[PDB]
Design an enzyme around this catalytic site. Sequence first.
Site, PDB file in Angstrom:
ATOM      1  N   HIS A  41      17.903 -65.250 -86.678  1.00 15.47           N
ATOM      2  CA  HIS A  41      18.614 -64.237 -86.107  1.00 15.47           C
ATOM      3  C   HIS A  41      19.387 -64.686 -84.562  1.00 15.47           C
ATOM      4  CE1 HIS A  41      14.957 -63.898 -83.696  1.00 15.47           C
ATOM      5  NE2 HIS A  41      15.645 -63.293 -82.698  1.00 15.47           N
ATOM      6  N   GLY A 143      13.755 -63.466 -74.614  1.00 21.99           N
ATOM      7  CA  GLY A 143      13.953 -64.861 -74.812  1.00 21.99           C
ATOM      8  C   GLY A 143      12.979 -65.703 -75.123  1.00 21.99           C
ATOM      9  N   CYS A 145      11.936 -66.058 -78.060  1.00 25.81           N
ATOM     10  CA  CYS A 145      11.977 -66.288 -79.573  1.00 25.81           C
ATOM     11  C   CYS A 145      12.031 -67.713 -80.161  1.00 25.81           C
ATOM     12  CB  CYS A 145      13.119 -65.278 -80.133  1.00 25.81           C
ATOM     13  SG  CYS A 145      12.878 -63.864 -79.954  1.00 25.81           S
TER      14      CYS A 145
HETATM   15  O1  U26 Z   1      13.805 -62.190 -77.463  1.00 26.84           O
HETATM   16  C1  U26 Z   1      14.035 -61.215 -78.158  1.00 26.84           C
HETATM   17  C2  U26 Z   1      15.100 -60.512 -79.024  1.00 26.84           C
HETATM   18  N1  U26 Z   1      14.373 -59.534 -79.635  1.00 26.84           N
HETATM   19  C3  U26 Z   1      15.264 -58.406 -80.639  1.00 26.84           C
HETATM   20  C4  U26 Z   1      15.088 -58.879 -82.098  1.00 26.84           C
HETATM   21  C5  U26 Z   1      14.710 -60.022 -82.476  1.00 26.84           C
HETATM   22  C6  U26 Z   1      14.482 -60.362 -83.775  1.00 26.84           C
HETATM   23  C7  U26 Z   1      14.773 -59.606 -84.665  1.00 26.84           C
HETATM   24  F1  U26 Z   1      14.449 -59.731 -86.172  1.00 26.84           F
HETATM   25  C8  U26 Z   1      15.127 -58.182 -84.308  1.00 26.84           C
HETATM   26  C9  U26 Z   1      15.386 -57.729 -82.927  1.00 26.84           C
HETATM   27  C10 U26 Z   1      13.064 -59.023 -79.306  1.00 26.84           C
HETATM   28  O2  U26 Z   1      12.395 -58.223 -79.884  1.00 26.84           O
HETATM   29  N2  U26 Z   1      12.720 -60.198 -78.319  1.00 26.84           N
HETATM   30  C11 U26 Z   1      11.520 -60.025 -77.967  1.00 26.84           C
HETATM   31  C12 U26 Z   1      10.318 -61.221 -78.395  1.00 26.84           C
HETATM   32  N3  U26 Z   1       9.232 -61.147 -77.888  1.00 26.84           N
HETATM   33  C13 U26 Z   1       8.929 -60.545 -76.705  1.00 26.84           C
HETATM   34  C14 U26 Z   1      10.007 -59.545 -76.353  1.00 26.84           C
HETATM   35  C15 U26 Z   1       9.693 -58.708 -75.178  1.00 26.84           C
HETATM   36  C16 U26 Z   1      10.703 -57.845 -74.318  1.00 26.84           C
HETATM   37  C17 U26 Z   1      12.120 -57.798 -75.109  1.00 26.84           C
HETATM   38  C18 U26 Z   1      12.159 -58.514 -76.375  1.00 26.84           C
HETATM   39  C19 U26 Z   1      11.272 -59.436 -76.763  1.00 26.84           C
END
Ligand code: U26
Lengths: 300, 300
Positions: A41, A143, A145
């Site tokens: 993603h 961030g 991911c």
């Molecule tokens: O970095 C990202 C990006 N995103 C959106 C997303 C990612 C993949 C998908 F398939 C669908 C949506 C998401 O949820 N994160 C986070 C991952 N971990 C902890 C988080 C804590 C707070 C905010 C974001 C957090």
Amino acid sequence: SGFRKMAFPSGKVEGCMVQVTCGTTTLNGLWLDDVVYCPRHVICTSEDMLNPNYEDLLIRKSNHNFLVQAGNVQLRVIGHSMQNCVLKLKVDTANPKTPKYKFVRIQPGQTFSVLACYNGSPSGVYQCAMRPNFTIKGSFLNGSCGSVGFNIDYDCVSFCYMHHMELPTGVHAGTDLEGNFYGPFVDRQTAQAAGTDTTITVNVLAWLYAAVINGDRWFLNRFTTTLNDFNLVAMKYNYEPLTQDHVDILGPLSAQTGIAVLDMCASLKELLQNGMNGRTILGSALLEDEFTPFDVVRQC
Amino acid sequence: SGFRKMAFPSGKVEGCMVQVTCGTTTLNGLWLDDVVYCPRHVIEDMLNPNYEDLLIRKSNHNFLVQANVQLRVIGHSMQNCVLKLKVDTANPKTPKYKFVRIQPGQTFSVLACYNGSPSGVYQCAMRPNFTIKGSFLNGSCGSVGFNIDYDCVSFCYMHHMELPTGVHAGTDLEGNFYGPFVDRQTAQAAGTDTTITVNVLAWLYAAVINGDRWFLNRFTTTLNDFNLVAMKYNYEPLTQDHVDILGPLSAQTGIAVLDMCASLKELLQNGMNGRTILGSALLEDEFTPFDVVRQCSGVT
Ligand SMILES: O=C1CN(Cc2ccc(F)cc2)C(=O)N1c1cncc2ccccc12
């Protein structure tokens, strides 16, 4: 003595963490030989996330749309392919820091270490388990991911988790290193529900054996139980069923302490019934389910 | 979101660990520049040792120092309770580092080792009684504790013994013990431990950041009235300095420190009334204020 939620040394993994930018999106990647692995993603925009079509977004990408930065270096992408939910970026440099490694898919209740990174930069390491609902209870900011989870066994790294997203309940979901999610989650920003979580029973038994190995017996009793009677009580406390496999797995700890598995099970039923009456077990005032039998043996 | 006991990545430190053997005893050492640091008790002796004379009787080749490679020992001296062994080759993986000495209530990461091989990393606090509740076994002597800050490893702890209550004792990297202890086989006990009040209040702040809010209360107290309850529960007195340090988290969350003390003073008398905070049924005192910030903001 003592007992800690103990992670593996993160150094073999620290050396594989790179940064991967696509458009205005930046996350972490995993550099092994000449392949950089990261969640797909990264090719998504803010309009995409509800219903992206990844085969169609990737076809529109050329190698040079992927900014890969290994610390100071910018790696040149010479190829891109997709495997399930992980993007594999081929580059013209094999990573000299590449350890002996395997990709492994774990089963719930397995423990592993997490190297949380932001911008390809390690922030901290910690231990956790795959919950029975395939969620993990992590520390993850926006961030993170692309952070991975692992075990090390005689200088061979077993990679078993890549981080993709946070669920509304506050917990986290991800995939093995062949890009197949753990649990029924998808890389899509639609409504998504963590299943009902439950205590990892075989782990709590292991933790009680560890507490005996360290010299506390105050929770034992003179009772025993059948496997089925134990499970009929445990489930009323949202505990996972215990199977014969679990009992076989605990054999070594039982042999070491001389407490039959089913006798240790009797202690647990009484613990669940009474609580702890102001006391603690290995410094926890709750029953601890994030240590596997292997863990307990390793540490003790 | 989430909140975990998070250790610093340990890669810079892993490359500094070696194996040191004098006669029959093996433990670990820290290899930095051209010196190998390890506890002096690596040389019937532990009963009443005169370390100056025991070291006189040893010669460089009594110390077999394995990094696969044997390092040639070209000199041996002692500083307080740590042996410094000079080696022919300087460690090419030597990070930028300092030796620091921390106060009780400060946290750090331990990288536990055995025969020179890093085995695990965990995070832990220096207790008010100057002990550490760690997880060490036979052969862990020489394991080190460190912090990292903007690329510089700050070494603060080296492990010597286990006290009969299961807690652990060691020195800073200059060989100065923490707490009133000595490296010798006698009866040594730790003092009445207390709880690090400011680390509990920081962790309550971290709970509010993560949604837990049921423990707050409209009321307010005085540092005087609070510290009268603190003494009753074996809590550390809360200084004026401590309140300032909580400034940033009293800003971020809009709960004044004296209010949070009221929330905690109530938690000390009435208990938590069958609830948990950040997944613990105990008041956690192993997260400093800066620990809380550094985790809930993602510094790397
Ligand atoms: O970095 C990202 C990006 N995103 C959106 C997303 C990612 C993949 C998908 F398939 C669908 C949506 C998401 O949820 N994160 C986070 C991952 N971990 C902890 C988080 C804590 C707070 C905010 C974001 C957090």
